[PDB]
Structures are given as C-alpha cells and as structure tokens.
Write a protein that binds this ligand. Sequence first.
Ligand SMILES: [Cl-]
Ligand SMILES: [Cl-]
Ligand SMILES: [Mg+2]
Ligand SMILES: [Mg+2]
Ligand SMILES: [Mg+2]
Ligand SMILES: [Mg+2]
Lengths: 222, 204, 125, 195, 195, 211, 196, 196, 233, 221, 5, 5
Amino acid sequence: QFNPYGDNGGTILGIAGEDFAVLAGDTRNITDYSINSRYEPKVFDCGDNIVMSANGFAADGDALVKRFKNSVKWYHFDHNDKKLSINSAARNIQHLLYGKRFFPYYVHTIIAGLDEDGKGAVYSFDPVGSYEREQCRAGGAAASLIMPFLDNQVNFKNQYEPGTNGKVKKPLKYLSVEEVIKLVRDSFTSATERHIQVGDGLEILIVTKDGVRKEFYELKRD
Amino acid sequence: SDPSSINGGIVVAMTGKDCVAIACDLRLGSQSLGVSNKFEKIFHYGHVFLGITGLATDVTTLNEMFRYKTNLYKLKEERAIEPETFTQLVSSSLYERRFGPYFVGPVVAGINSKSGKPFIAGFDLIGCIDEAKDFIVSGTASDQLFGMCESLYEPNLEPEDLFETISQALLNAADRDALSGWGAVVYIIKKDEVVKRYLKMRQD
Amino acid sequence: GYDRALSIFSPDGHIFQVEYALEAVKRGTCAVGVKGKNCVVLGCERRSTLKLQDTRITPSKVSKIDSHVVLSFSGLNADSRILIEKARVEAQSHRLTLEDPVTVEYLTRYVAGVQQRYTQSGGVR
Amino acid sequence: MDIILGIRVQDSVILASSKAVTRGISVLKDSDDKTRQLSPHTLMSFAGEAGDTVQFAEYIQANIQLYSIREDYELSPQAVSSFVRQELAKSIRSRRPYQVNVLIGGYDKKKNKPELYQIDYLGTKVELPYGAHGYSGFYTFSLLDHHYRPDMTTEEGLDLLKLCVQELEKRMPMDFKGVIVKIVDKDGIRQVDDF
Amino acid sequence: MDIILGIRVQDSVILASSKAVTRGISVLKDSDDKTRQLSPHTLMSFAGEAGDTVQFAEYIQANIQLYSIREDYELSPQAVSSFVRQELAKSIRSRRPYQVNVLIGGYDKKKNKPELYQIDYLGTKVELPYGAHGYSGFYTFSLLDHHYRPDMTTEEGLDLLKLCVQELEKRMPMDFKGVIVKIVDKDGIRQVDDF
Amino acid sequence: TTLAFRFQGGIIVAVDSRATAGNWVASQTVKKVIEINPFLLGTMAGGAADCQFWETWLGSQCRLHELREKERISVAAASKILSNLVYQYKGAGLSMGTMICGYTRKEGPTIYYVDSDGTRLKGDIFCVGSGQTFAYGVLDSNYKWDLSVEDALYLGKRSILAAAHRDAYSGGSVNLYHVTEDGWIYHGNHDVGELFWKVKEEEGSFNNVIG
Amino acid sequence: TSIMAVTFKDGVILGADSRTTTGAYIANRVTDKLTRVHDKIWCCRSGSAADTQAIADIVQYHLELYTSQYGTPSTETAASVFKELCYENKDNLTAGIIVAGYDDKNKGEVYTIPLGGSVHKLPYAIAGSGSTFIYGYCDKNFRENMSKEETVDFIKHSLSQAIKWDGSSGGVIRMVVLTAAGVERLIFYPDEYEQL
Amino acid sequence: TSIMAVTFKDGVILGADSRTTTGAYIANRVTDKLTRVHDKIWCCRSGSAADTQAIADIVQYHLELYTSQYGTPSTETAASVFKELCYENKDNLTAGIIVAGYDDKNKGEVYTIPLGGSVHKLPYAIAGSGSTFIYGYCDKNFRENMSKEETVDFIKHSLSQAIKWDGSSGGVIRMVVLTAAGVERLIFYPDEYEQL
Amino acid sequence: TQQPIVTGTSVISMKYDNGVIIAADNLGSYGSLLRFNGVERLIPVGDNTVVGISGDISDMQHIERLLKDLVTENAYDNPLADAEEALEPSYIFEYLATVMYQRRSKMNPLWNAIIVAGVQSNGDQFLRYVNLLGVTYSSPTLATGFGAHMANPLLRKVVDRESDIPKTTVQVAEEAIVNAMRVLYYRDARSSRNFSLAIIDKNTGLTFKKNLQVENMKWDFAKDIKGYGTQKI
Amino acid sequence: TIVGVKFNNGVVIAADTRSTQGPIVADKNCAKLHRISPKIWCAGAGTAADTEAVTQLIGSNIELHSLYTSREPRVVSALQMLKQHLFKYQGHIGAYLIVAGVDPTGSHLFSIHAHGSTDVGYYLSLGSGSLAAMAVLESHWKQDLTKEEAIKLASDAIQAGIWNDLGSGSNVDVCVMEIGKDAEYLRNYLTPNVREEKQKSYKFPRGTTAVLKESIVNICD
Amino acid sequence: XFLXX
Amino acid sequence: XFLXX
Ligand SMILES: [Cl-]
Ligand SMILES: [Cl-]
Ligand SMILES: [Mg+2]
Ligand SMILES: [Mg+2]
Ligand SMILES: [Mg+2]
Ligand SMILES: [Mg+2]
C-alpha cells in the first residue's frame, strides 16, 4: 500500500537573545541509510525579519515554507505593506498546519525573529499547529539529544549557586550572539557524533534589527 | 506492552583521572503511575559496580544472580572479581538467554585493583559488550543522556569535577523523560574509597 | 432557478416593489399594539363582509411564536404564515443552542432580517 | 449512562434513571438527570453512547415543542413514540447512527390512560406494562413478571420500583449512584426528591 | 478481585481488601476474604485473574507453613517476600504465568518493626510505607502522599484507611461492596469486624 | 492534569504546565488556561493543537455574541458552542477534555465539563487529564463548600502538585486562577521544582520521598 | 491465454489460442480472442474476458465515430485509444492487449499494451500466460520481412509450444491475416499443431 | 537461476548460470551452481542457496560412506538420497535440484527433483526461474544421442535465452562434462553467449 | 494507490566545470522478466534540458506527453520562445515537482524518480531530483534506485563538494558515469548492457548519445572459482 | 561495512568501527575484526552479540580441534563449523561473516550469511554499506594485487561505506594474513573522523549540583 | 509527533 | 534495544 509520508532526517535549533535570535539547522538530507544531499538548506529567510524551518518530511516542509512565504506576500497586498509581526506569523502558521489536521504536515516547525519590542523571539510548532513562544527549542531527529543540553546551558536548569546549599538557583541572563553560536556549534558537533542522520554541514541564520546574516560551518561527513 | 519502558529508569557511568563515577535515578513506576521513589538500580560485588535499567523484575533477578556467581567466584578463586572479568561474566549470562532474554540495559563500572586503571562498559539485553574510554548510558532517557554526556564530558576530570559533570548529565536528561527522575544517586569511585551522594532534583 | 431581480431601484431612488408591498399592508385589516405598565395588548380588526364563518377553526389573527412571545400582522394572510413558521423554528433553535428562550428584540430582529433578505434576493418579491 | 427503568401502573407511568456519569476509572458526576420533558404529559428517559444521548433527546424535545406551538395542541404519547421511532429508524442506516435507547412515559389525556413505550437505537418500538434498557432488564423483567399487577397504584408502583433498585444495587457490578424517579399522570410530570 | 490496599504505620501494618467477587453482570459474593495467613506475624492479600489468585496464595501458604514446621521457626517478612517474588519471577516466564498481584504485610519480631511489601505478577518487589494494586493506587497514593505520617498509630492508620475507602466509593466506577480490614503487629494478625 | 471546583468565594481553577509527545517531555511552560474574556476561563486537556485551536476559536464566537447581542455570553451558551462543535467532528479523532468556568449575573459562578465525544456536564467539582484521579484523591478528601479564598487557592494548587508528583505525564508548574463576581484573577505561576520541597517542609507531607 | 502479432513483407498476422478458463475448468474451448476494432485494425485480448470485451467495444465505437468525421484512423491512433482506457483505468482493469493494423503508407504495425497501460511499438509482440514459455523460441526464430507462409509457420510453431506447456492455453489456433489484399481468417486444429 | 542437464552419446553435460541475487541486488556474479556429490555424480542447485548447500553436503557425506562399504553408487542411488532429504523435509526446504551422473553400464542419466521432493528420470531436465522462458526452445531443439559439441551448443543457446529474459539469471555460463574420459569444466563469458 | 508494472531502473548524473551529464539504461522490466529492450528513459526538453525518469514506464510516457505539451504551450503568443522566454531547466523541474507532490497529496502518485539535468540561460549548471513523494533535493551527483547506493559513491570520489566542480572536465566526468553504468550492470539484476547518455554543456550545447554498451568488463577470474567452499574441482 | 580482498601471497580483511542502536551511535570505535585462530581472522556484520558469540564459539572448538589433531587449523574447518551452526538456527542467529586466513593448504577468502549459505571470491563485501564498498571493489579490483595495493583497495572500499552509508562511520580496522608470516592486526589503521576541538569547556564550578546526602561505601570485607 | 495533563 | 556495518 502507498505510504504518502517519508523521513528526510536532519535536526534544527532556535535560540533567542536580548536584541537578536538564531535559527540553526544541519544541511544533510537522507532517506533510510542513504545521503541524498550534504548541502540542502531547510532554514529560510521569509521576509519581515522572520526566519523559518519545517524539519521532518522535506516535501511537507517545503510545501509549508512555500505557503507561509506566500502568506507574507498577500499580507502586504491586503494590509498596505504592513510588517507581519512574529506573533501574527505564528498564529497564521497554526491555521496553515491545523488546516490539514486530518492529513497532517509531517514536520516540526520553528520560526525566529524579533517581537514588536525589538527583543529576540523563537516560536515552535507540533505537526498539527500547537505553538508556544520559548527562549530555546531543538526540533527533528536529534532534538532529544540537544534539548536537555539547552535546558542546562541556556535556561541554567538544575544549576545552583555554589555554597548556597542548593537553595539559590543560578540567575537567568540573556546570552551574547558569540556565546549562543558557541552553544549551537557544540550542540550540532555532539548531535553529529551520536546521531547518524545529522552531519555534513551547519547553516545558522542570525536575525537582528539590521537584517538577516548567515554563517556556515563544516560538520563530520560519516 | 514494551518490557524495557514499563517501569522506566536510567543509569550513566563516566571515567575521570584515576577514578570512575556511576549514577542512576530512583523511579520505579507502572507506565504513568509512579510507585516507588527508593528503587536503586546500582549494585556492587566487592569493588565492581553494576547499574541495571529496564524491566524491574529482571533488574532484581540479575542482581541476585550476579551476587550468586561472584560469591562462588571469590570462594574458588580466593580473590575479588575484577571489572574486565565481571564484564565477560555478564555478557556470558545474558547471551545464555539469547531467545528468551532479560529486558535490561546493564552498565559495569570499577577500578582494576592490580593495574589501577578506570574501567566502564555497557551491554544490550542479549549481552553485546560496549566498552568506552569516556562514558556509558542506559535507560528510557538514553537519547537525552547521549546528548548531555557528548557535550558536557571532557577527559581526565578530578573526582570532585567529575561528580558535577555526571550529576548535571543525569538530572537534565531525567527532566526531559516522563518515566525517569524521582530522585538520583551518584557513586564516586577512587582506588580505595567510594563516596555515595543522593542528588536533589525536581519530583515530577 | 428563477433569478430575476424583481426588487430594484427607480430613478428617484425608490424600490417600488417594497413600496407596493406597503400598499398591500395598507389594504390589510387594522392591527393595534398597546403596552401598559405590566402588560402588552394586541387588538385586531376582522372585516364583517364574511358571515357564515366558522370562528373555531378559522386562523386567528394573533399567533404564538413561543410561550412568552406573540405576533400579529396586517397585509397578505398567506405571506404572514411563512414569517410565523420561520420565527417559531428560530424560537426553538435559540432554546436548543443558547439554552434560553429568545428576547422579543432578537425574535423581531430575525423576522425583520427575513423580510429584508426578500427585498434584495433574486426571483422573490 | 446505564440504568433506565419504566413501570406503567393503573393511573400513571414511573421512570427511574441512574444518576452516575462515568468516563474511564472516574465517576465524573453522581446527580445526572437522564430525561427530557417532550411535552407537559410526555417524558423521555435515554441511555447509550456519550454525547449522542443528550444531542438526540434535545433534538426530539425541540421538534415536539415546535409542533405544540404550531398547532396549539399536545401530541399523544403514541404519536410522539411513532415520531421518535422513525427518527431512530432513519438514524440506524445513516453515516453515523444515534446509539441511544429511550423509554417514553406519557399520559394520553383523550383516553385517560398511562402509556410506556420502549424504543432501542435500531428503532424497535414496543408498548409495555414495564420496560428496561441495557443489563438492567436481565434482573428487573423476571422480578416484575412476579410482583407486577396491572391495577396497582402509583405508591404500589414506587414500592415495586424500590424492589428493582435494591436488586440492581445488590447484583450489578458497577456503582450507578442511585436513580432519579419521575411520575407522569393526568396532572403532568413531577420528580420524587427522596428516593 | 480488584481493590487491595496496605498502610505501614509506627507499630503495625494494615491491609484493606474488597469483598466483591464479580463474574459478568452478576456480583456472585459480597463477603470474600482476599487474604491468607502465611505465618502468625505475616499476612498476604492478593488480586488478579480468577482461580490463579487463590491457587497461588494457598500454594505460598503451604510452603511457608512447611518451612515453619521443618525449622520450628517463623521466617522474617523480608525472607517471605523474597520467596514470593522469586515464585512470581519464575512464573512470568512459564507456559501459563500466575496473573496475581500481592501485598505482604508482616511484623519482624527480631527488628520489632512493621513491614509492607508490594509485589506485582511480574515479580516486581518494593518495600513501601503505603501500597495499592490495580486502579485503587491512582486515587489512594496522592491521598496518602498528603495525609500519611510515618509516626502514626494503628487508630490514626484506620482513619487514614477510611479516608481512602470513602474516596474509592465516591469515584470508582464498580461497586466493590466495602473492604475486610486486618491488622498485623507484635501480637500477630486480627480482623476489624466493624468497617 | 487540570481541575476547577465551586465554593463559597466563587470558582478556583488550577492546571499543570507540562506537554508530552509519548514518553518525551516536550515542554514544561504551556498555558492550559485560555482567558476567553474577563468573566470566562477555558481549561485544556488532550491534543494540544485541538484544545488550543478550538478554544481560541470559541473566544472569537463569544466576542461575536456580545457584538450581536450587546451582552456577555452565558457560561452555558459558551460551553454549548464548543460541545456542538466537537459533536460535528465526533469519530474524526478529535481528543480534547475541557472545562468552561465563568461568572454571569443570571447563572452566578458556573463550571461546564466538555469533552471531544460530545459529553457536556454542569457540576461543582471536575478533574480532567491523565492525572485527574490523583487530583480527585486530594481535592475530594479536603473539599468543603465553606473553604476560604486562601485555603481554596492552596487546595487547588496542592491537588495539581499531588498529580504532578505521581502522574508521569503531569508536572512543570501550577497555574492558579480565582473567578469572582468581578471576573477572573490570576494567582501566579508556581514551579513544582521549588513548590514540592516548600510544601514538603512546611506541610510535613510527602514522607514517601527521601527528604 | 497465448496470443501474438507478427509483422511481415505484405502486412501483419494476428495469432491466438481458443481457451477461456475459470480456475482449472475450461469455460469455452472455441473462444475468438482476435476482435475487429476497424476494417484493417484488429486486437488480441488477454486478462479478464469481461474487461477486454468492454475495452474493445468502446475502442470500436471511438474508431467508428473517428471514421465518420476524419476518415480511416492509423494503427497508432487505435493503440492510443486502447492505451487511454487501459492507463486511466489501470486500477480497475486486468487487460493485456496487442493492437495490430495494416495501413497502405505504414504497412503492418504491432503495438503491445501490458497491464500498466504503457504503449510499446514492436516488430512482433507475444502476451498472455502461455507467452512466458516461447520468449526463448520466438526471439531465436523471428526474422523481419518474412513471407506470409513463413509468418504463419512461425506463429503456428510458437503457439503450439505455448499451448503444450501452458495449462491455461489450448483448443484451436485462430489467426487473422491483415494485408492490402484484405482480411483472411485461418484456423488450425489440435491433430495438426500438437505433432509439430 | 537458470540450470539444465542434457544426456548425449558419450555421457551427460551439466549447465548453469553464475548469478545469486538478494531481491534485485546480485550478491555473487561468479557463483558455481554445479557441485560434486561423487567423482562422476554432479548436481545442479536452484532455490535457497543455504538449503541446497546443506543438502549437497549431506548427500556427498552419504555417497562417501556408501563408497567406503559398497563401492561406487549408481546415479539413481544418488537421486534417491537427494529425494529422501527433499521429500522428508519438504516443509522446511526451498530446493530444486537436477542430479546428473555417468555410469559405464547405464551411461549418462538425468534425474530432476522439484520442490515437492518427487523424482523424475528424463532424457534432459531444465529448472530455476529462467527455465520458464526456454521450455518452448529446448523442447523444439533437443534430440537424443547428440554429440558433445551439439549438446554444448544446445545448453549454451538455451541458457543464453534464459539469461537474456530472466533478471534472476546472468553472469558466466558454467558447464561440467561427465563421460568415460573423465570430468571436464567449461566456462562461457557474456561477450560470447549474449550475441548468439 | 498504485503498484508499478513495467519499470525502469537507475538514472545516474553529475555536474562538471561547464555543464551536466545524465545516463540511464534502455530496459523496461516486467518484474523479474526483462520484457522491453528499446525503452528511451532520457527525454530532452528544448536544447538545454534532459529529464531522466526511473520507475513505472506508463507514468513515464504520461510525463513525456506533459513535457511535450509544455513546449507547445510555451510557444503560444511568445515571439521569444526560442530566445529569452525559452523553457529553462528550473521552470521544467518546478512544474514536474508541483505535479509529483499534487499527485502524492491525492493518494494517486506518478510512481517515478526523476532527475532534471540542464544548463540555465546564465550558464549555471542545473541538476535536481524529484520522486513519487514530491521530495526534492540537489547535489553535485544525483542517482535513483541502485544508482543511489553504487553510482553516487563512485561519482562523489570525483566531485565530493561544490569546489570540485570547476576542477572536473567533461572527459573525467563522462569516464566516471560510463564506469558507474558498468558497476550497475555487474550488480543490478534489473539493469541492461545497452544505455543512453546525454551531455548538456554551456558552450557545445546538448549532445544526446544513443545505443551505448557497457564494455571492458572483468569476467576472466570466474574460471578459477570452483564450488561454494570445500570443492577442489 | 566489512570487506575481504585476496592478493598474491595472502588475504586482507578490513571493517569500519561504528556500532548503532536504532539511529543512535552506541560505540564510535568498536572492533568488528575477530580472531578465530592466530592465522584465521573473521569480520562480522548483523546482530553484534550474534557475530561475537558465534565467532568465539567456533574459535574455541577450532582451538580444541587444533590441539586434538596436532595441526594448525584450516579456514574450511571454521567455514564448515560456522555454516552448519548458522543453518541449524534457520537465520535466527543474525551473523553475516567474511571468513579469511592462511593455513597449510594456502590463503582463503569466504563469506557466510545468517541462513548458512557460503560464497567463494577474490573480493567480497557484507553489511549495510556493502553496495558502496562493492562499487569501489568492482571499479578498482584486478588480478595479481600486491600486499600494499590490497590494503589500499580494502581501506578505500570501507571508506566508501563510512562516507556514503549512514550505517557505517568512524575508523578503518585492517588485518593482513600473509603466507609464511604472522597475521598483523592493524587496529584503527585509518582515523579520518577525529572530533574537532569544542568551542567551549563545560567544566562546572564545584558545588553547582544540589546534594541531599553523602556516605562512604564499604567495598572491603 | 503531536504533543498531548 | 539491540545493537547492530
Ligand atoms: Cl471471450
Ligand atoms: Cl550458491
Ligand atoms: Mg554523523
Ligand atoms: Mg521526571
Ligand atoms: Mg510526574
Ligand atoms: Mg539477465
């Protein structure tokens, strides 16, 4: 019997700073035990300082990104070139995903950018459109490896102030763009080591008020 | 009805500078229902430490079985079994039940009393040996532990530093798994002293 | 389906079909409504050119829409039945979804809405 | 939904309906009224699939109430039962049938007689002196076969009904949290508050 | 078979076990004692598959009684619990396993301490301050987490147990016909007749 | 695990903040209470997407009611819009277990249980979710009508904590709400990480756990 | 079933057996599996009898309506109509059809249409259950621009072997000759072809 | 697989392809499907490689022990031992074996043993997936008391067609000649047999 | 819901300094039966694109007709149909990629794996893959079926990343493709010896080579292999 | 990914060092090269436990046989004992082996499948990355390879697996068995997958982790 | 996958 | 679980 779904592997990672937000994703595309491409980008600039990635089944992922990019275009036409806010984009994507509640998009969606106060924002979606704003989210094949590391290093979970008898927690603070990219690079090198579907290359998209910058780093190709 | 994920639980073992650390959570449940928050998964036969995850009845059975076999070993050999030898005994015993296996993920940890070399090893349910310089992981949050260990770990950590690394690896991994947590225990093992610490972690 | 726009504007900005529908009301028997301090009374004229009538079975001029609301009318008798039926159905439909009987304002607003719909729908007068 | 009983006596119909609403291993409510008044002298108790029961009951209620307003006249229990049966008879061959079993207890004002109708979800109608739906019948029918008389009073009917509830409370596996009892007679519908 | 509870307090172990034996849509019995005395200071309550429960309980009883005669000595609750667990641990990989869950409430005369062991049909043993088998736990564990204290008396333990039975009688779907309560202490095993 | 009970001082609503995908803890920072309007609250249990989508949709339908009728929607009418919606989708595989809690003049404080198989129940106490039984155990054994606003808030919080502990699929943090004649009042986010130990020490409960 | 179409100097020859079976029972032992869709466009039917009969009838209707408007259709056009039905209804059809026609311009042409509904133009085509046993024989023995008598012998010997080994094939060997001369029907009985 | 054994004037010749496949992947393209069970009794293996290897090894053991006690066994005796294993274990075996041996009294003999475990003594035998395509060809072309060169050409042309049509068959054509002279091995490469 | 009847095997391709090479054997398999031997599975669109198709042949012939019709439709009311407004490889691919995903979304897929190889108007090499699921990806080397498992490893030794493309000549690139086709003939049970090869160069344009054969094959070592283990004869 | 290559005066087997549980890499540097006897070495793919267990068992019985017969063991003895064991278990023991070695008879190279079918060849490849490896072997193999050429071809065939197959990765293990010489086991012959320096040290300040209890454990008698 | 207290 | 190149 024809199975309309497939697993294209890979993993994605979104971290939000004070005045910036990064959306990272490995460039490896796979089916079963074969590599399709060592460089197939799945993190996209969608305009209005919104970066988006729909990891999982690449066909459904591409279809969704394509439809959202088109949603941004028609938002400009219908509302006098008004800038689509990250919170408005998030709600719009929920309706795109839930629109196919009974034939779902088999993807974990993450968008990143700046909120209307100019502060870093990351939104994460399940396949059927349940969304939530977070400081931190890993999605895809190696999400289970990366996410608990992010809890520890970004949100300082299970970390207490030395000598305070585990009474005072390590205080929350925003990370610099330099410190965040270090965590992203260490997260993906760790994920590459222990997950077979992750490797080849790492592509990070950084979003500030100035615009969308890109950075690329080599990963292990085994 | 997946034997390995009915009761839940995790074990992690790491090596340091002239020392080894083995740690485990304390949860025993029946799927969603948490039953016991005192169920320790790490045992020891002389100076050799064994941590077992998986189906709880088999964890208890194998502990009793390896106590049985190490006791007879010591009486006949007139010496305590070493980690390298015990690892082979575990592998032998598990594969003996190849087509009716114990649903477990055992982890050996200890220091060879002769050479003084730190030793850790992991097994599948049918006794395949997984030897490692760095760390071994096991249980329902093995994916989480692999991610934590691979990032946090660095070689030749001092016993006091190694404790912090293995503890943070277990705690953060256990918090992302529903069937693990409910308290944790960490064994710091030096050549001729062993410290056992109970960790404070979120009880949900 | 019959699509013809029967209700349309005239050069002077009048919809003659709607205004000729008022002439039909002006022909109809007189109906009066007077509300007191703690009651409303609906008075209705019945023309006396009809003797040998059976007043037991002859449709009454005042109709119950629900147990708490009534509707009297002036104009075409056949037309009134269609509005009364729709109103009675909407009355029960409101109780079913809102778990509360209609307000007199709501029931009126609905009936008025139906009358309006027939003034810019194709194929209907 | 589980236990609904009905006993027609000399001058009235008595409907007893369990108060328990259970979902999984939790009794969510122990005061549920599994009945709707279709007209002043017609009452319908219902049991079956969750959601379908109330949705169906209220749909019938709305239709009978619409008729009452239109004609300024109360439909006979026989007429209402026939309407309900046809709706279920339609339903069973629908895409998703109503999985609802009903008892219709009514007093015919023209005949001056009480009437009890038992209709299952297939649209199977029968007029009975006493009726039950689900596993209740397996105990109550044999009990009523013995103790029931046609010329009994409402008070004798309630004592006969107490004998049924006691037997069910003794031998039924599930806790149905007692019953709400309602009497249909010439004076309309009223609820027994202390049972 | 359904509800078996256990509460270890300061100086005793208290076992509560439901009295209902249900087969199909009939409560066959409402006075069933779901327990066997393994030794003068060890009691085992049991619940699970019909037939297996009593067959297993009596088999264990016979083995512990045989030991008591042979050595002229009572086995510790810990020793008995370990024996029972091994029998179930053998059973689960048999052609037809015993589908029986047990609580072992015992008073260790050497330690002068009460001990409560919870063992499921897989042979999963845990020592607990309070234990339950089946759906009972889903209500009683959270309740005891709140109200239980380790230094409580037998009377405080019985009041704590009444609070559990009341909650189960309120929210449990099935009628389990109350519980038989038994206390294990330094003076042996005795039954509470009025609960 | 979510619960809402009616008492002398109005309605208490308490929910956990955990979302799971199988045995994977996906989030511990989820809003399971949707603020439909100043006098209406909606609880969420089941499919995150189904609850989130349809309860924000319900909020739009409740806004359209007060625009059309120049009057705030009744808790009964609001709950029945949702129950009639999910009933249209009955058998399609919608998984939602919700409670519509609010105050109006004609009704007073009201709670309606609405689930995806079309069940709609008015009641004083409801616990919905995988850890509903654990919440019931503590809530029922401590519930009285004559609880104070302070005691009621705590019992609601303590009942979630009990379930958050025992139920593997419940935890993260407790979100408290108090609904009065003047509308709903938020009573803060309470992390189980700190709350458990604070409650254990002060109350002397949770003796099963190693202190 | 055993069927084939062979192209030669003067045109094309269609050959088929005469056995229709239900399980291991022979429903019809004198079946005509060679059917006329046009004067000098014929087809060979394999698979479900009901399906192949339905398709053939529709094609004949289409080519009759084509002829009324645009004159005589090409053999390629006929094969295209067959393909269109077989391809668009591939889920609900079990039909292996060989289309064979004689034009004056294009001479003898053979198109084979397997289950999928794909079209393959070939110098000769074999199809049906019994074709499997004569792939080796037909490949070795076929030559282009054969004579009428050579092609008749080629088809006769081929279907003789197909019939001998395939239980689903047997009865008489029917053949239809398509040339400029006209349409000739040939029949060959067991007593002749069995002892080849 | 495509395998066959042909009897001629001076004895018998065994022929086989060299293709072992897992699904549509070729595990071994130089397989030896002709195996020695005795000095002048050889067999052709088709079906499960594992099953046929296991059977062949046991038969070789049996005929070695037979020879130690009762001297050289007959080709019929060898076929009987094969049958006994194939028949008694028919539920757990996928083995189509052709047994071919040279006696001085009985000359060249061929026995075929299909899946069932039945024995059939024939003048020549074909077996394996690729045999289906050459039933027509082999029947028409086989003659009794052929020469060595004629039989080699018959097998080569036959397996050439089998290989051409069967995807499960290919590689080199191995052949083993069993005569009074002794045992001769022959190999034929694609570049030769493909363009026959 | 479909099942593929008549099927075509591996399509292999790679980029080089000035353009792209694509190849596919001329076989139409009917399960294990190697039924049809004259099947062209490379279909040129204009003078700047070649679409290589594997999988179901009936669906391949449907895609042929769509591409044929696309050229006709593009020519309508288009004075620059053979110049600036000619069909690009990127236009042809995106059209197919749209159809393939639309068909999978209606649970009635075109049972194919497609590689669109060509050169854009600005001289850039175009090589992208699409299949029955509507999954699309691009790489210096692309292959379908067995090609993905056996050809890609060999072609990636020549062009392992982007920077290797300018360093690879058409002579080296074609040699690697022809070598890969030989390896597939050794090891793919549903492959044939006869194949087609197409080169789209930005300078020399489209070169379509038909009736190529696998040659320089190693079979000699087979004679030395006797038995399955212990056999010495 | 495991392969065997024959050269003039012996045989060489190579294997990758990746062990996987589902999609997760359990062991980054495990040993798939097993010593059946001093001059008979085996490379195993399939169920890790089964390949290790079956190679040890036959290796044990081969040693007892060697002592009994006062002879150096033969590759055909290991081959026969392995295939008859695997066949008996009807493929339930998931061991896919490349058996190679030198003995008094000469140099030998065989492959064994889980169901008990054996194959002979000059070059063989088994495992998930066998197609990637066999592609290289089919491209570059020739008759009359030298020792250094065979090691290069074997390691190149493993590398093809490491890079292209997700099942294979990390390092290349090699064992060279030459006639008249001791078999040289080249553990981690190539290490082309070294982990790059981490961007940051995650060494925690001492006292970061919250502790409830401490206690000295008694390991002594 | 989709998230499911 | 079970480890499986
Ligand atoms: Cl016919
Ligand atoms: Cl073989
Ligand atoms: Mg990797
Ligand atoms: Mg936890
Ligand atoms: Mg929990
Ligand atoms: Mg072939």
